[PDB]
Amino acid sequence: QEEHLKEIMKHIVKIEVKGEEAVKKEAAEKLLEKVPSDVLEMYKAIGGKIYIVDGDITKHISLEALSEDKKKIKDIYGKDALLHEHYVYAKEGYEPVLVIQSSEDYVENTEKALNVYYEIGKILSRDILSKINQPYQKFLDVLNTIKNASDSDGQDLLFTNQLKEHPTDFSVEFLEQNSNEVQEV
Amino acid sequence: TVPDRDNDGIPDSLEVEGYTVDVKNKRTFLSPWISNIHEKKGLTKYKSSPEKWSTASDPYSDFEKVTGRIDKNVSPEARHPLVAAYPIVHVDMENIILSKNRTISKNTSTSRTHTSGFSNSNSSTVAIDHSLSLAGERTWAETMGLNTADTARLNANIRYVNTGTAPIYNVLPTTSLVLGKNQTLATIKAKENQLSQILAPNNYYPSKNLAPIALNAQDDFSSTPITMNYNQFLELEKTKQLRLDTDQVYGNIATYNFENGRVRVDTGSNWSEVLPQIQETTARIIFNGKDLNLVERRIAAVNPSDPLETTKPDMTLKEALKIAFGFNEPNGNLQYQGKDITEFDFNFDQQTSQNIKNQLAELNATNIYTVLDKIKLNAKMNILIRDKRFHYDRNNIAVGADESVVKEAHREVINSSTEGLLLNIDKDIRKILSGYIVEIEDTEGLKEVINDRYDMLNISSLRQDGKTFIDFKKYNDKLPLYISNPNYKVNVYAVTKENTIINPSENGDTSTNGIKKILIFSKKGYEI
Amino acid sequence: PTVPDRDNDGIPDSLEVEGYTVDVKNKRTFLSPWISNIHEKKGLTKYKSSPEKWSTASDPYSDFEKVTGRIDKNVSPEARHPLVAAYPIVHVDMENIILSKNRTISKNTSTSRTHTSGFSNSNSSTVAIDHSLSLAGERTWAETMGLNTADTARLNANIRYVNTGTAPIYNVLPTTSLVLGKNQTLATIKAKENQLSQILAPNNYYPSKNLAPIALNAQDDFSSTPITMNYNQFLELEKTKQLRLDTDQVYGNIATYNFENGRVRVDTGSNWSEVLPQIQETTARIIFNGKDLNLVERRIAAVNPSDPLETTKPDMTLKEALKIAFGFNEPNGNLQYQGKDITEFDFNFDQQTSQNIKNQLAELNATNIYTVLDKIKLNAKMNILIRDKRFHYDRNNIAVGADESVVKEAHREVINSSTEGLLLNIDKDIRKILSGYIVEIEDTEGLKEVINDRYDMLNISSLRQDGKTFIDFKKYNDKLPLYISNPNYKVNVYAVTKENTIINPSENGDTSTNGIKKILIFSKKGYEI
């Protein structure tokens, strides 16, 4: 009994108060930490860099003037959300830019970090690797093995509806003709 | 290595955000709720408190409940972490017998009761059959040779009913019979070292296959334990009903042991220490949907005033109904196997009322049925949902209904002859119908009531195929039905319990004259 | 870093002395040092406690659990503050009695938890029997019951238990002895064995109001008439109609919280009979009759100069105590309870406390404590009694009367008047100091006709189900309406407070309302009805 008290004690009693705004800066930096550093160097080399805003992501100089129409985004779960409510958006162009909304709850929860990591991969696959066409047969080979496997819900996990309806196995032509579909997966 | 303050197996983040366990071919592992891959498989989205070894506070941990390492007897709907699992025992009296310290043996029907300022104590209510098994037994006072200076003996048979959600093991509750407002006739002994069996939820003890426990010991404890002076018998004649109040002192609790999976009863933990917590940190929902019987469930709601207690995931009423009873949304419309949520009344205690009037204001709505899914539950509110279609008495038991509903339920004549009707009516109706009045109408407006006595109405039976069968020869002269005119109308009236008379009137009238009777059938003589 | 915590109570030292607070973070609770500016807008209370006491209050619940909530969820809200001792308070409530001889008078009683003066730490109550005559012809009990000089009467009562404390009781239920007069002990109610298996959470009844009360007589063979009583006793009873119920403090064991799995199990080692002595000698006692004119007792932890360990407790100023113990707040920086200013209360002190506070009042050069209220330091063992200044009181600190001026103001709202009665709507508290009403009619030339002109014929005032008081004339009339000799004749109604009542016929057995100090309460002419 005397043993147990210690562990609970440390977790609840935060000895000192970091401050009102420090936590925000500390949260984001820890988040980006988990992604392998080597990825960050690739991002800077191709140009634009991620800057963390604090207010409503909906209203920023860099993003206000562009893509108002593309207000429809699909989350990881495939559900559509309006951008203003959403807490992180990215944009692909001549100046690759990624913007993340500051918050204090990135360590504690996980559902928010997942979207951030989701956004890092699309930049990685669509904007980085595309200059070298790195997704190729090896990615295609695993891909093909997924379609044909015993009642594998894995498909449900990674394929959209369009893919679950291609009757035969995937062909190198599809990636060429359709290259948006593969990059999300 | 992942933090885990409550030390309950599940890591923190999972508990707050939502998780679900799903078996991969033969191995069970715990996983975060994924919207697309779990929904097609029909798994429920769990939430819980990272700081409660059992969010509900009952003796089963948050982890154990959803995984099943638990007494396999807790009813299914209570495996969900936000549903308190606890026992609820009440007593059912099947039949009585009377004599004097010429024996009145009548069959009884009992009901678990609930009244209004209603408190956390279970109670039931017996109702004595009034129909006359014997023709000649007018005035019980004489059928039993009871004199002013006599005493009658009472001898009952009893069975136990578990309508809760968890098993009791060793003890069996003490329970005291009480007549009237405060004249306690007897306290039913707690038989000793005799309830070595188990009372699982939704079961009877003793089971339906055995004789029910005779109430009198048949030993030497008291020669006639249930004595009763003359004066009670008089009061007994005017009310024809008793109440049986029982307390909640149950036995020990069966806990799950991880080392070998054996379920052994620990003699340290006792249900009498847990119930107060449950009764003080959950929302109370009263429901009469299933079989027009009151099923009680308790749901964990937040209480702003308590730090630790605010940790539990917020529960919105609609969601509560989803996990506690089985309501679902085929088309997004709340319904219980078809019956939409809108066919029920909501009544609230004054305390509970105050909280809800506030809640309806910040949403700017007047009809609760729309914004229903936006009402937050706080601790200690008590909510009662009753069928809007039926009439009710003081003890919130179903006693009647509007006549109009009654007729359509009878508009289906499967067959008709000169010996009776064989209907197939919804099993629920025959709990608000006391009996039927048969009458014949002369071509010139006369009226002949066959069973023209207050205590002679129970003539309608039910066949083994669920077909109700009304027997005329029961309270007839064992003779078929005569008709003086193929043009003479035959009228049949039904009498609901609420509209019944239980004793002869002031001047001892026995005719069914001043009884409000509803016409239920009227066909031509030739047609029959 | 091994942050120091000598008291071994989870919260570290520095935090305990200076001030901290618990705050729920979305779904996770964490402990923080008090920041003045960022927490204040959120309505969080600044706690303080003792770094060298596992339980500043000294009750069996460490400082840490209380604010964190790991505790029997039954402890009353008001007891979460670390500086309010949580312990049980059991007193006995008797609802009604019945009498006969070993034509049986079964009459209803009213009880109030009492407290009198040199007042000591032991609870007792006092029941009061209604004196009004339910039956007309039962004048003189001595005859309604065939009582002879060499006879004995039998007593059979019903009682209920009341928990006015701050903690639950579990196994046992206390013994309590009935006594008439100064020292006449009639009976001690046995401690039934293994029968009070239920729980008394604070402000609850046992058994609840919906069940039969525990019958006092066993109804078994223990004693044929346990309440024997020689004639002489009956005489004292006839003159006073008062009984005392002394109850002891032998409670059961205590329910403690287990960290390992969060089950609240009743531990058989710790027993309230070991803790209370500690509490009663290290806390300040505050008595208040505010809520419903009933005596609620709370205990606050104060410093005791003489004891090293005891100076450790955070200094407690009187004003905040009132804030945290009862619910007082500062709408405008003025201490107040729902409208009622602090100025509407009396301050009475025991001789010790009086001496101590006069000194403290001297170094500040003040005369009105109501000003310097926030500067009085509490020491251990003061006893303070807070009573409504507006009501008159008897020796046993029971509400018994009030100043007449208040009485008229309480009636200035005539909702309705007719020849069948009044349907008034009065503040629930006043009707606890009014014994009954005298109705009279006044001839146009100054005559006076009192309808119910008997001392024991006053219970004519009912209460409607909507809280509207209803006075029935036909009750102690001849079941006939009210006749009026003149549409110009005034109809006078008087109210009689308990203190001004008579309880027995006078020397010559007078039943007239002559020697009763009477206050006029209503006067409308015959046509104003």
CSV table of N, CA, C and O in Angstrom, one decimal, chain B residues 201-287:
chain,number,residue,atom,x,y,z
B,201,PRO,N,-29.6,-13.1,-12.3
B,201,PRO,CA,-30.6,-12.1,-12.8
B,201,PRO,C,-31.6,-12.7,-13.8
B,201,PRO,O,-31.3,-13.6,-14.6
B,202,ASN,N,-32.8,-12.3,-13.6
B,202,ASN,CA,-33.9,-12.7,-14.4
B,202,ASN,C,-34.3,-14.1,-14.2
B,202,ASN,O,-34.6,-14.9,-15.1
B,203,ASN,N,-34.1,-14.6,-12.9
B,203,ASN,CA,-34.4,-16.0,-12.6
B,203,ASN,C,-35.3,-16.0,-11.4
B,203,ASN,O,-35.4,-15.0,-10.7
B,204,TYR,N,-35.8,-17.1,-11.1
B,204,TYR,CA,-36.7,-17.2,-9.9
B,204,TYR,C,-35.9,-18.1,-8.9
B,204,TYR,O,-35.2,-19.1,-9.3
B,205,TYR,N,-36.2,-17.9,-7.6
B,205,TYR,CA,-35.8,-18.8,-6.6
B,205,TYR,C,-36.9,-19.0,-5.6
B,205,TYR,O,-37.4,-18.1,-5.0
B,206,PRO,N,-37.3,-20.3,-5.5
B,206,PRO,CA,-36.7,-21.3,-6.3
B,206,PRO,C,-37.3,-21.4,-7.7
B,206,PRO,O,-38.3,-20.8,-7.9
B,207,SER,N,-36.5,-22.0,-8.6
B,207,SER,CA,-36.9,-22.0,-10.0
B,207,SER,C,-38.3,-22.4,-10.2
B,207,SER,O,-39.0,-23.0,-9.4
B,208,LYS,N,-38.8,-22.0,-11.4
B,208,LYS,CA,-40.2,-22.3,-11.8
B,208,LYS,C,-40.5,-23.8,-11.8
B,208,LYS,O,-41.7,-24.1,-12.0
B,209,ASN,N,-39.6,-24.7,-11.7
B,209,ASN,CA,-39.9,-26.1,-11.8
B,209,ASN,C,-40.2,-26.7,-10.4
B,209,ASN,O,-40.5,-27.9,-10.4
B,210,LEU,N,-40.0,-26.0,-9.4
B,210,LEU,CA,-40.1,-26.5,-8.0
B,210,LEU,C,-41.2,-25.8,-7.2
B,210,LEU,O,-41.7,-24.7,-7.6
B,211,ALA,N,-41.7,-26.5,-6.2
B,211,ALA,CA,-42.7,-25.9,-5.3
B,211,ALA,C,-42.1,-24.6,-4.7
B,211,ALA,O,-40.9,-24.6,-4.3
B,212,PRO,N,-42.8,-23.6,-4.6
B,212,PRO,CA,-42.3,-22.4,-3.9
B,212,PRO,C,-42.2,-22.6,-2.4
B,212,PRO,O,-42.9,-23.4,-1.9
B,213,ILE,N,-41.3,-21.8,-1.8
B,213,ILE,CA,-41.1,-21.9,-0.4
B,213,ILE,C,-42.3,-21.6,0.5
B,213,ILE,O,-42.8,-20.5,0.4
B,214,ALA,N,-42.8,-22.6,1.2
B,214,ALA,CA,-43.9,-22.4,2.1
B,214,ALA,C,-43.4,-21.4,3.2
B,214,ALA,O,-42.4,-21.5,3.8
B,215,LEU,N,-44.3,-20.4,3.4
B,215,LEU,CA,-43.9,-19.3,4.3
B,215,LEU,C,-43.9,-19.7,5.8
B,215,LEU,O,-42.8,-19.5,6.4
B,216,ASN,N,-44.9,-20.3,6.3
B,216,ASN,CA,-44.8,-20.8,7.6
B,216,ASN,C,-43.8,-21.9,7.7
B,216,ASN,O,-43.6,-22.7,6.8
B,217,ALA,N,-43.0,-21.9,8.8
B,217,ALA,CA,-41.9,-22.8,8.9
B,217,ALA,C,-42.3,-24.2,8.9
B,217,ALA,O,-41.6,-25.1,8.4
B,218,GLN,N,-43.5,-24.5,9.6
B,218,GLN,CA,-44.1,-25.8,9.8
B,218,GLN,C,-43.4,-26.4,11.0
B,218,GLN,O,-43.6,-27.6,11.4
B,219,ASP,N,-42.5,-25.7,11.7
B,219,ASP,CA,-41.7,-26.1,12.9
B,219,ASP,C,-42.4,-25.5,14.1
B,219,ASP,O,-43.6,-25.1,14.1
B,220,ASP,N,-41.6,-25.4,15.2
B,220,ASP,CA,-42.1,-24.9,16.5
B,220,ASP,C,-41.8,-23.5,16.8
B,220,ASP,O,-41.9,-23.1,18.0
B,221,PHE,N,-41.3,-22.7,15.8
B,221,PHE,CA,-40.9,-21.3,16.1
B,221,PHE,C,-42.0,-20.5,16.6
B,221,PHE,O,-41.9,-19.8,17.6
B,222,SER,N,-43.2,-20.6,16.0
B,222,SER,CA,-44.4,-20.0,16.5
B,222,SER,C,-45.5,-20.9,16.1
B,222,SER,O,-45.6,-21.4,14.9
B,223,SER,N,-46.5,-21.2,17.0
B,223,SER,CA,-47.5,-22.1,16.7
B,223,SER,C,-48.4,-21.7,15.5
B,223,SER,O,-48.7,-22.5,14.7
B,224,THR,N,-48.7,-20.4,15.5
B,224,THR,CA,-49.4,-19.8,14.3
B,224,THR,C,-48.7,-18.5,14.2
B,224,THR,O,-49.2,-17.4,14.7
B,225,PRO,N,-47.5,-18.4,13.6
B,225,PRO,CA,-46.8,-17.2,13.5
B,225,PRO,C,-47.6,-16.0,13.0
B,225,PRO,O,-47.4,-14.9,13.5
B,226,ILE,N,-48.4,-16.3,12.0
B,226,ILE,CA,-49.2,-15.2,11.4
B,226,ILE,C,-50.5,-15.1,12.1
B,226,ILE,O,-51.5,-15.4,11.4
B,227,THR,N,-50.6,-14.7,13.3
B,227,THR,CA,-51.9,-14.5,14.0
B,227,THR,C,-52.5,-13.2,13.4
B,227,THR,O,-51.8,-12.3,12.8
B,228,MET,N,-53.8,-13.0,13.7
B,228,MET,CA,-54.5,-11.8,13.2
B,228,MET,C,-55.8,-11.7,13.9
B,228,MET,O,-56.8,-12.4,13.7
B,229,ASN,N,-55.9,-10.7,14.8
B,229,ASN,CA,-57.2,-10.5,15.6
B,229,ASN,C,-58.3,-10.1,14.6
B,229,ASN,O,-58.1,-9.7,13.5
B,230,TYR,N,-59.5,-10.0,15.2
B,230,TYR,CA,-60.7,-9.8,14.4
B,230,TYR,C,-60.5,-8.4,13.6
B,230,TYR,O,-60.7,-8.4,12.4
B,231,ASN,N,-60.2,-7.4,14.3
B,231,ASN,CA,-60.1,-6.0,13.7
B,231,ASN,C,-59.3,-6.0,12.4
B,231,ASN,O,-59.7,-5.3,11.5
B,232,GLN,N,-58.2,-6.7,12.3
B,232,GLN,CA,-57.5,-6.6,11.0
B,232,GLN,C,-58.4,-7.2,9.9
B,232,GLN,O,-58.5,-6.6,8.8
B,233,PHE,N,-59.0,-8.3,10.1
B,233,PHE,CA,-59.8,-8.9,9.1
B,233,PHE,C,-60.8,-7.9,8.5
B,233,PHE,O,-61.1,-7.9,7.3
B,234,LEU,N,-61.4,-7.0,9.4
B,234,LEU,CA,-62.3,-6.0,8.8
B,234,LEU,C,-61.6,-5.1,7.9
B,234,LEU,O,-62.0,-4.9,6.7
B,235,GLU,N,-60.5,-4.5,8.3
B,235,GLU,CA,-59.7,-3.6,7.5
B,235,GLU,C,-59.3,-4.4,6.2
B,235,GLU,O,-59.3,-3.9,5.1
B,236,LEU,N,-58.9,-5.7,6.4
B,236,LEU,CA,-58.5,-6.5,5.2
B,236,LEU,C,-59.6,-6.5,4.2
B,236,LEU,O,-59.3,-6.5,3.0
B,237,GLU,N,-60.8,-6.7,4.6
B,237,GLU,CA,-62.0,-6.7,3.7
B,237,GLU,C,-62.1,-5.5,2.9
B,237,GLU,O,-62.6,-5.5,1.8
B,238,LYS,N,-61.8,-4.3,3.5
B,238,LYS,CA,-62.1,-3.1,2.7
B,238,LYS,C,-61.0,-2.8,1.7
B,238,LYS,O,-61.3,-2.3,0.6
B,239,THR,N,-59.7,-3.3,1.9
B,239,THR,CA,-58.7,-2.9,1.0
B,239,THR,C,-58.2,-4.0,0.0
B,239,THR,O,-57.8,-3.7,-1.1
B,240,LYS,N,-58.3,-5.3,0.5
B,240,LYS,CA,-57.9,-6.4,-0.3
B,240,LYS,C,-56.5,-6.2,-1.0
B,240,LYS,O,-56.3,-6.6,-2.2
B,241,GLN,N,-55.6,-5.7,-0.2
B,241,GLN,CA,-54.2,-5.6,-0.8
B,241,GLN,C,-53.2,-5.4,0.3
B,241,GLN,O,-53.5,-4.9,1.4
B,242,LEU,N,-52.0,-6.0,0.1
B,242,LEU,CA,-50.9,-5.9,1.1
B,242,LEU,C,-49.7,-5.5,0.4
B,242,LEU,O,-49.5,-5.6,-0.9
B,243,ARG,N,-48.7,-5.0,1.2
B,243,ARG,CA,-47.4,-4.5,0.7
B,243,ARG,C,-46.4,-5.3,1.4
B,243,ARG,O,-46.5,-5.7,2.6
B,244,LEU,N,-45.3,-5.6,0.7
B,244,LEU,CA,-44.1,-6.4,1.3
B,244,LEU,C,-42.9,-5.6,1.1
B,244,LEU,O,-42.3,-5.6,-0.1
B,245,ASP,N,-42.4,-4.9,2.1
B,245,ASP,CA,-41.2,-4.2,2.0
B,245,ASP,C,-39.9,-5.0,2.4
B,245,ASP,O,-40.0,-5.7,3.5
B,246,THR,N,-38.9,-4.9,1.6
B,246,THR,CA,-37.7,-5.7,1.9
B,246,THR,C,-36.4,-4.8,1.8
B,246,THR,O,-36.4,-3.9,1.0
B,247,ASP,N,-35.4,-5.1,2.6
B,247,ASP,CA,-34.2,-4.3,2.6
B,247,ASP,C,-33.2,-4.9,1.7
B,247,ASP,O,-33.4,-5.9,1.1
B,248,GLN,N,-32.0,-4.3,1.6
B,248,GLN,CA,-31.0,-4.7,0.6
B,248,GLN,C,-29.8,-5.3,1.3
B,248,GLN,O,-28.7,-5.3,0.6
B,249,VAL,N,-29.9,-6.0,2.4
B,249,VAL,CA,-28.7,-6.6,3.0
B,249,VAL,C,-28.4,-8.0,2.3
B,249,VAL,O,-28.9,-9.0,2.8
B,250,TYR,N,-27.7,-7.9,1.2
B,250,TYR,CA,-27.3,-9.1,0.5
B,250,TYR,C,-26.0,-9.7,1.1
B,250,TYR,O,-25.6,-9.4,2.2
B,251,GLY,N,-25.5,-10.7,0.3
B,251,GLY,CA,-24.4,-11.5,0.8
B,251,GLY,C,-23.0,-10.9,0.4
B,251,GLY,O,-22.8,-9.7,0.5
B,252,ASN,N,-22.1,-11.8,0.0
B,252,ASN,CA,-20.8,-11.3,-0.5
B,252,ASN,C,-20.8,-11.2,-2.0
B,252,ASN,O,-21.9,-11.3,-2.6
B,253,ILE,N,-19.7,-10.9,-2.5
B,253,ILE,CA,-19.5,-10.6,-4.0
B,253,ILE,C,-18.6,-11.6,-4.5
B,253,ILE,O,-17.6,-11.9,-3.9
B,254,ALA,N,-18.8,-12.0,-5.7
B,254,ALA,CA,-17.9,-12.9,-6.4
B,254,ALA,C,-17.0,-12.1,-7.3
B,254,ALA,O,-17.4,-11.4,-8.2
B,255,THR,N,-15.7,-12.3,-7.1
B,255,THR,CA,-14.7,-11.5,-7.8
B,255,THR,C,-13.8,-12.5,-8.7
B,255,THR,O,-13.8,-13.7,-8.5
B,256,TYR,N,-13.2,-11.9,-9.7
B,256,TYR,CA,-12.4,-12.6,-10.7
B,256,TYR,C,-11.0,-12.6,-10.3
B,256,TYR,O,-10.4,-11.5,-10.1
B,257,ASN,N,-10.4,-13.8,-10.2
B,257,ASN,CA,-9.0,-13.9,-9.9
B,257,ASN,C,-8.2,-14.2,-11.1
B,257,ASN,O,-8.4,-15.1,-11.9
B,258,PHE,N,-7.1,-13.3,-11.4
B,258,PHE,CA,-6.4,-13.4,-12.6
B,258,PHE,C,-5.5,-14.7,-12.6
B,258,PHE,O,-5.2,-15.2,-13.7
B,259,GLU,N,-5.0,-15.2,-11.5
B,259,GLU,CA,-4.0,-16.2,-11.5
B,259,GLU,C,-4.5,-17.5,-12.2
B,259,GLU,O,-3.7,-18.1,-13.0
B,260,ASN,N,-5.7,-17.9,-11.9
B,260,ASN,CA,-6.2,-19.1,-12.6
B,260,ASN,C,-7.6,-19.0,-13.1
B,260,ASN,O,-8.1,-20.0,-13.5
B,261,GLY,N,-8.2,-17.8,-13.1
B,261,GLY,CA,-9.5,-17.7,-13.6
B,261,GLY,C,-10.6,-18.4,-12.8
B,261,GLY,O,-11.6,-18.7,-13.4
B,262,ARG,N,-10.4,-18.6,-11.6
B,262,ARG,CA,-11.4,-19.2,-10.7
B,262,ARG,C,-12.2,-18.1,-10.1
B,262,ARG,O,-11.6,-17.1,-9.7
B,263,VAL,N,-13.5,-18.2,-10.0
B,263,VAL,CA,-14.3,-17.2,-9.4
B,263,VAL,C,-14.7,-17.7,-8.0
B,263,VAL,O,-15.5,-18.6,-7.8
B,264,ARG,N,-14.0,-17.1,-7.0
B,264,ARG,CA,-14.2,-17.5,-5.6
B,264,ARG,C,-14.8,-16.4,-4.8
B,264,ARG,O,-14.5,-15.2,-5.0
B,265,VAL,N,-15.7,-16.7,-3.9
B,265,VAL,CA,-16.4,-15.7,-3.1
B,265,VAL,C,-15.5,-15.2,-1.9
B,265,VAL,O,-15.2,-16.0,-1.0
B,266,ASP,N,-15.0,-14.0,-1.9
B,266,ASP,CA,-14.2,-13.5,-0.8
B,266,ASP,C,-15.1,-13.0,0.3
B,266,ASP,O,-16.1,-12.3,0.0
B,267,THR,N,-14.8,-13.4,1.5
B,267,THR,CA,-15.6,-13.1,2.6
B,267,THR,C,-15.4,-11.7,3.1
B,267,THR,O,-16.0,-11.3,4.1
B,268,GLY,N,-14.5,-10.9,2.5
B,268,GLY,CA,-14.3,-9.5,3.0
B,268,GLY,C,-15.2,-8.5,2.4
B,268,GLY,O,-15.6,-7.6,3.0
B,269,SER,N,-15.5,-8.6,1.1
B,269,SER,CA,-16.3,-7.6,0.4
B,269,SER,C,-17.7,-7.9,0.5
B,269,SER,O,-18.2,-9.0,0.2
B,270,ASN,N,-18.5,-6.9,0.8
B,270,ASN,CA,-20.0,-7.2,1.0
B,270,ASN,C,-20.8,-6.1,0.4
B,270,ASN,O,-20.6,-4.9,0.6
B,271,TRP,N,-21.8,-6.5,-0.3
B,271,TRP,CA,-22.6,-5.6,-1.1
B,271,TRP,C,-23.2,-4.5,-0.3
B,271,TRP,O,-23.5,-3.5,-0.8
B,272,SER,N,-23.3,-4.7,1.0
B,272,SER,CA,-23.8,-3.7,1.9
B,272,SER,C,-22.9,-2.5,2.0
B,272,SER,O,-23.3,-1.5,2.7
B,273,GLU,N,-21.8,-2.5,1.5
B,273,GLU,CA,-20.9,-1.3,1.5
B,273,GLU,C,-20.8,-0.6,0.2
B,273,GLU,O,-20.4,0.6,0.2
B,274,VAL,N,-21.2,-1.2,-0.9
B,274,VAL,CA,-21.1,-0.7,-2.2
B,274,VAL,C,-22.3,0.1,-2.6
B,274,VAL,O,-22.2,1.3,-3.0
B,275,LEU,N,-23.5,-0.5,-2.4
B,275,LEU,CA,-24.7,0.2,-2.8
B,275,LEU,C,-24.8,1.7,-2.5
B,275,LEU,O,-25.3,2.4,-3.4
B,276,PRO,N,-24.5,2.2,-1.4
B,276,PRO,CA,-24.6,3.6,-1.2
B,276,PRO,C,-23.8,4.4,-2.2
B,276,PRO,O,-24.4,5.4,-2.7
B,277,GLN,N,-22.6,4.0,-2.6
B,277,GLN,CA,-21.9,4.7,-3.7
B,277,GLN,C,-22.7,4.7,-4.9
B,277,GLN,O,-23.1,5.8,-5.5
B,278,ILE,N,-23.1,3.6,-5.4
B,278,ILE,CA,-23.9,3.5,-6.6
B,278,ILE,C,-25.1,4.3,-6.5
B,278,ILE,O,-25.5,5.1,-7.4
B,279,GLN,N,-25.8,4.2,-5.4
B,279,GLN,CA,-27.0,5.0,-5.4
B,279,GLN,C,-26.8,6.5,-5.3
B,279,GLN,O,-27.8,7.2,-5.6
B,280,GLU,N,-25.6,6.9,-5.1
B,280,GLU,CA,-25.3,8.3,-5.0
B,280,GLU,C,-24.5,8.9,-6.1
B,280,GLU,O,-24.3,10.1,-6.1
B,281,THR,N,-24.1,8.2,-7.1
B,281,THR,CA,-23.3,8.8,-8.1
B,281,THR,C,-23.8,8.4,-9.5
B,281,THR,O,-23.0,8.5,-10.5
B,282,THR,N,-25.0,8.0,-9.7
B,282,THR,CA,-25.6,7.6,-10.9
B,282,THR,C,-27.0,8.2,-11.1
B,282,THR,O,-27.6,8.6,-10.2
B,283,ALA,N,-27.3,8.2,-12.4
B,283,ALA,CA,-28.7,8.6,-12.8
B,283,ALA,C,-29.6,7.4,-12.9
B,283,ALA,O,-29.2,6.3,-13.3
B,284,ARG,N,-30.8,7.6,-12.4
B,284,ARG,CA,-31.8,6.6,-12.3
B,284,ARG,C,-32.8,6.7,-13.4
B,284,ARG,O,-33.4,7.8,-13.6
B,285,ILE,N,-33.0,5.6,-14.1
B,285,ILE,CA,-33.9,5.6,-15.2
B,285,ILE,C,-35.0,4.5,-15.0
B,285,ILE,O,-34.6,3.3,-14.9
B,286,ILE,N,-36.2,4.9,-15.0
B,286,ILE,CA,-37.3,4.0,-14.8
B,286,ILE,C,-38.0,3.7,-16.2
B,286,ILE,O,-38.4,4.7,-16.9
B,287,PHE,N,-38.1,2.4,-16.6
B,287,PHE,CA,-38.6,2.1,-17.9
B,287,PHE,C,-39.7,1.0,-17.8
B,287,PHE,O,-39.4,0.0,-17.1
